[PDB]
Amino acid sequence: ALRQARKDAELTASADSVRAYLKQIGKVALLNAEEEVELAKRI
DNA sequence: GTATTGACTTAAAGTCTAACCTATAGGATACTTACGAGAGGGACACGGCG
């Protein structure tokens, strides 16, 4: 229902392409300090 | 007047040095989604017949 409409809106054209880039970047969330330390040690 | 040579001075330039541009890098608290009509053609929905 509501989640179905969410998934339907997840697949739209978005001809602006800045809105498309924003919906693309919306996929990945933030991180906090300890995982930053872990990533730095790994790299 | 028209043919010369021998000095005699003069304005215009290759090269070394200095400053003034130019390409380039760097700069740690933590901050995470802007602001009219007029006609033709193609695509999506809905209903009809075998």
Resolution in Å equals 3.4
| Dihedral-angle region of residue A36 (phi above 0 means left; psi in -120 to 50 means alpha; beta otherwise) | alpha
**Which residues, 6+ apart, have CB-to-CB distance to A14 below 8 Å?**
A20, A23
Kindly state the DSSP code that residue A28 receives in the 8-state scheme: S
A36, A27 in Cβ contact below 8 A?
no
Chain B bases closer than 7 angstroms to a protein Cβ = 32-34
Experimental approach was: cryo-EM
The strand B neighbours among A residues 1-43, by Cβ under 7 Å, are 16, 18-19, 22, 25-26, 30-31
